[PDB]
């Protein structure tokens, strides 16, 4: 039971992995699109503890939290329905399945190129029986102008 | 010029939260210096502003000042005062001597405050009763930090502990961890007279109580201030006074360069390696 | 055994005069700790005992506390706070970070209190009038230490300076050196509006006045205490509060390792050598 | 005077093992300074004597000197060099500036050598193969200390690493942990 709308003017996203340029481009796009609040709520990076990272909302500075575990970000950001997974081909499967363990996420974008087809099949099966749409692996993502932008879609400003 | 015109954004590499000097007036954690002085905040209030960014109540500030007073100095025999005196007698300046003395402050010298606070907080947060806590410490062969002194014991108490304990009794609103430490002290003293609560253990438990019950901190804020080493800072700031006093004393006494006597050193060297 | 029986005499390698921990009670330069606390001698009184072996009057103790409060911190841009922040962001402990910040305290940073006191005392001890002192400093190519502010010029004075000046006026019995420094300040403000008495110069001259007029020190005792670096100790102890606050703040903000940008460094290396 | 007559016993409060200077000749851990110099030891040999009290072979001393050479400096941007420069520009003397720089050496800055050695030794001492070591470190969310470079990926190797590795190949008798780290 997928949804007919998946990017919105008030959508929020969790970025998996340490991709500062991608999320900064996301925030630049959000600011130019006259969004009330940034589209990236938090970031998940297993190799550094929970902290906050500086980013530019237009000309001012904001702090976006970074979490070791997807669980904490999932708990304290219940408004997030999109996850952009920058995990490599080796950890994209586990990260995607762990994200699908959470019902609030309706859209998962997978950027990694080179995921084995059987693991991708299992991802499709889990998403289909969980009602979660998947911007398929080996992609740049997608862009809804005025509402949301996935990763490095459409280049920089 | 570009920043003034707003044409350029460059990320700031530093964050600060304790003091702002850019404006007309100096500001201590969102509070102007004249406002600090006009309402009779002391060293304790300024310390609270600079270290916790909080407006501590008057009794908390007075207790912080008392903690700085009791740990000011404990003679020249301790490692830090020894090092400060050696460096002062070597012709070095105040900063170098005080620094050489301070660098010995760590696990063995001066770290009983933070270790005592951590252990008593861990024991109290878990449901173990004082007797169970003492038995569990005995099982692991780990000494209870903040318990036991050599010269002083029961019937000849440590008077610094008595002063601080009296202040906490008649001023603090609630001291759960202090009562827990007092029960542990009763158990250990019934075991053995010299195992009394130290100034280190008393300061640690009363500092945790002050953080948790002054009303200016949430549980996790007090926990993180304890964890990051606020009590290390308390001891270091207190003992810097005594170390500077020792440096000034050695400079005033015109003591010469120090060399350890050879008869006090046991030389044990390889045969020809 | 030989020492107990008195057969052997052995010179003591250390002399101390500030604290005695051997006895039943801790003693701060002849005053027991219970007497220290009963007499309501705050941090200023304990500092006086440990640094000068004198029981200073209450106004002197409060003035010392105020001097410690005004110099507690001055933002993170100064050299010492910068070094402390760098060391804290490198994951070091409190003692290492505070020490790394303190090691920058010297002639260019933090020595303005002692230098201003020495300069004004040297001028005042000789008979030269304030105008002769200003002209002599100008002729020697030396700026007057303790004179000059970046923004505070006239009708917007340095508020810390004003607070300390008010306390010194309404509490000190006699401040000849402060009056001399204020005449010098009048001359230099006639030259240029922002050449006012710093907090450094005010603290130096008021500390010399306190030493020379509190009634506890002879002239040579006060001169010796100024010479050996008592004001350096005052600044170091005061600024240690702000440095520990900066360390705790960087720890709480969970800041990461700092690396200075390559664009801010001018690499000028030999071509072949 | 009673000590010159053998009438008093006092316990020694300190123990030392690296250097004896009471006698006529300076001794570095059981070896006179003339003996140190006549057999063409260098910084590495004296370092071995003073730190380990051992007679390291010449290749070990040369390797220690090479390690001191490659870690001598890495520019002014690092935390320690930054602190040293800040303290030097503040007018402090050599000891204070070098001290302020050194005090930043710890976990985040300068501790990668000890951490890398510790974790590689802990892995190698256990029976886990390099692949299992990589997976184990990945599972715990912990990067491998000693792995990673901003540049110098492939066919443009880091050159200090190349020099040290070549020396260790051509002089060391056996390098088990080096081979383990190279498989990693
Ligand atoms: C202060 C201290 C160093 C003095 O220890 P001490 O002089 O060796 O005390 P003792 O002569 O009783 O010898 C140790 C014995 O008492 C017990 N003991 C000593 N300190 C203890 C403590 N803090 N907790 C529990 N048991 C302790 C030991 O189990 C040992 O028992 P045993 O004789 O049956 O083996 C020691 O109590 C200690 O390490 N305390 C913890 C650290 C601390 O508080 N620092 C000092 C703050 S100023
Ligand atoms: C170099 C100089 C100090 C010579 O020293 P000295 O005063 O003759 O003797 P020392 O300072 O070595 O020590 C005095 C004695 O105590 C002994 N002693 C030294 N250190 C000792 C220690 N830690 N424990 C016990 N005994 C010690 C020495 O064996 C020496 O023996 P002596 O009785 O035969 O003289 C003196 O000539 C001088 O000041 N010259 C100026 C040049 C200079 O400063 N050089 C720097 C030296 S590296
Ligand atoms: C080693 C390790 C930090 C690799 O770092 P990295 O993220 O690949 O690269 P850096 O952290 O050096 O910095 C990345 C960029 O900052 C730049 N940079 C580094 N120092 C700089 C400075 N002072 N000013 C400006 N830019 C700088 C680099 O040139 C690099 O440029 P790029 O973005 O064009 O590639 C990482 O793999 C790691 O932590 N490994 C653990 C093992 C370890 O710690 N090794 C010991 C270190 S010697």
What is the sign, positive or negative, of the torsion defined by CA atoms of C211, C214, C218, C221?
A: negative
| C contact chains, 3+ CB pairs < 8 A | A, B, D
> For residues C210 and C237, is the Cβ–Cβ distance under 8 A?
no
Cα–Cα distance between A145 and C241 in angstroms, integer? Answer: 52
**CB distance D68 to ligand 3 below 6 Å:** no
CA-closest residue to ligand 2 atom 29: D22
3-state secondary structure at position A21: helix
Measure D148 CA to ligand 3 centroid, in angstroms. 8
Report chain C residues whose CB lies below 8 A from the CB of A52: 254
How many beta-carbon contacts under 8 Å exist across C and D? 91
Contact D99 B95 (CB under 8 A): no
Measured CA to CA in angstroms, residue B77 lies from B28, B74, C14 at distances of 37, 8, 10
Measured CA to CA in angstroms, residue A31 lies from A13, A25, A64, B12, C37 at distances of 15, 10, 15, 20, 60
Radius of gyration of chain A (CA): 15
**CB distance B242 to ligand 1 below 6 Å:** no
By C-alpha distance, the chain B residue nearest D48 is: B273
Cα–Cα distance between C244 and B46 in angstroms, integer? Answer: 12
Radius of gyration of chain B (CA): 23
CB atoms within 10 A of CB C15: 12
Q: What is the resolution of this structure in A?
A: 2.7
Contact B260 D14 (CB under 8 A): yes
Cα–Cα distance between B66 and B214 in angstroms, integer? Answer: 16
Cα–Cα distance between B107 and A11 in angstroms, integer? Answer: 50
Cα–Cα distance between D50 and B158 in angstroms, integer? Answer: 44
Cα–Cα distance between A31 and A146 in angstroms, integer? Answer: 9
Chain-centroid distance of CA A120 in Å reads: 18
> For residues C80 and B19, is the Cβ–Cβ distance under 8 A?
no
- In terms of residues, how long is chain D? 184
Identify how the structure was determined: cryo-EM
Measured CA to CA in angstroms, residue C160 lies from B46, C71, C154, C203 at distances of 14, 9, 15, 10
Residue spans of beta strands (DSSP E) within B193-270: 265-267
Look up residue B133 and give its two tokens: 């806590």
Report chain A residues whose CB lies below 8 A from the CB of D138: 91
**CB distance B200 to ligand 1 below 6 Å:** yes
Measure D151 CA to ligand 3 centroid, in angstroms. 8
Pairing of strands B19-20, B27-28: antiparallel
Contact B273 D29 (CB under 8 A): yes
| Helices C230-252 + C58-70 axis angle, to 10 | 50
Look up residue A126 and give its two tokens: 């889990």
Burial of D134 (0-12, 13-18, 19+ CB in 10 A): middle
**A63: part of which helix (H) or strand (E)?**
strand A60-67
Start-to-end CA span in chain A (Å): 35
Q: Spell out the long-range contacts of D123-127 with Cβ–Cβ below 8 A and sequence spacing 24 or more.
A: D123/D180, D124/D176, D124/D177, D124/D180
**B43: part of which helix (H) or strand (E)?**
helix B43-52
In sequence order, the 6+-apart residues with CB closer than 8 A to the CB of B52 are B216, B217, B225, B230, C248
Question: A51 φ, ψ to 5°?
Answer: -160, -165
> For residues B273 and D54, is the Cβ–Cβ distance under 8 A?
yes
Contact B262 D55 (CB under 8 A): no
> For residues B63 and B84, is the Cβ–Cβ distance under 8 A?
no
**CB distance B261 to ligand 2 below 6 Å:** yes
Contact A46 D143 (CB under 8 A): no
CB proximity A61 to B under 8 Å: yes
3-state secondary structure at position B141: coil
Look up residue C80 and give its two tokens: 């010492």
What is the sign, positive or negative, of the torsion defined by CA atoms of B262, B266, B272, B273?
A: negative
């Amino acid at each position: 039971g997928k949804s007919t709308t998946l990017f919105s003017r008030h959508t929020k996203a969790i970025v998996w992995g340490m991709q500062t340029r991608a999320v900064q481009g996301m925030l630049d796009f959000d600011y130019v699109c006259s969004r009330d609040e940034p589209s990236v709520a938090a970031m998940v990076y297993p190799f550094t503890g929970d902290h906050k990272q500086k980013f530019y909302w237009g000309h001012k500075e904001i702090l976006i939290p970074v979490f070791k575990n997807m669980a904490d970000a999932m708990r304290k950001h219940p408004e997030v329905d999109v996850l952009i997974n920058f995990a490599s081909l080796r950890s994209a499967y586990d990260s995607t399945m762990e994200t699908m363990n959470y019902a609030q996420i309706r859209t998962i974008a997978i950027i990694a190129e080179g995921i084995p087809e059987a693991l991708t099949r299992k991802l499709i099966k889990k998403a289909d029986q969980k009602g979660v749409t998947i911007i398929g692996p080996a992609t740049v993502g997608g862009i809804k102008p005025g509402c949301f932008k996935i990763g490095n879609t459409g280049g920089m400003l | 010029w570009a920043r003034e015109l707003g044409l350029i954004r460059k990320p700031a590499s530093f964050m600060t939260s304790i003091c702002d000097e850019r404006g007309q007036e100096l500001i201590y954690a969102g509070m102007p210096i004249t406002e600090v002085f006009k309402e009779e905040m002391g060293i304790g209030g300024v310390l609270g502003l600079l270290w916790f960014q909080k407006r501590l109540p008057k009794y908390s500030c007075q207790f912080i000042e008392m903690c700085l007073m009791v740990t000011a100095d404990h003679g020249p025999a301790v490692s830090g005062a020894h090092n400060t005196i050696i460096c002062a007698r070597a012709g070095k300046d105040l900063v170098s001597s005080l620094t050489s003395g301070l660098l010995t402050i760590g696990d063995r010298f001066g770290g009983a405050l933070d270790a005592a606070a951590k252990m008593f907080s861990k024991a109290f947060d878990s449901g173990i009763i004082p007797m169970e806590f003492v038995n569990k410490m005995k099982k692991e062969g780990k000494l209870i930090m903040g318990i036991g002194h050599r010269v002083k014991s029961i019937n000849n108490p440590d008077m610094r502990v008595q002063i601080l304990k009296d202040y906490v009794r008649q001023h603090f609103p609630a001291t759960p961890l202090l009562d827990y430490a007092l029960e542990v002290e009763k158990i250990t003293t019934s075991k053995k007279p010299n195992l009394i609560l130290n100034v280190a253990g008393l300061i640690g438990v009363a500092f945790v109580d002050m953080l948790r019950n002054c009303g200016s901190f949430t549980r996790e804020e007090a926990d993180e201030y304890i964890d990051i080493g606020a009590l290390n800072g308390i001891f270091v700031l207190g003992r810097s006074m005594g170390f500077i006093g020792h440096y000034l004393d050695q400079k005033r006494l015109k003591q010469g360069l120090y060399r350890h006597p050879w008869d006090d050193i046991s030389y044990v060297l390889p045969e020809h390696m």
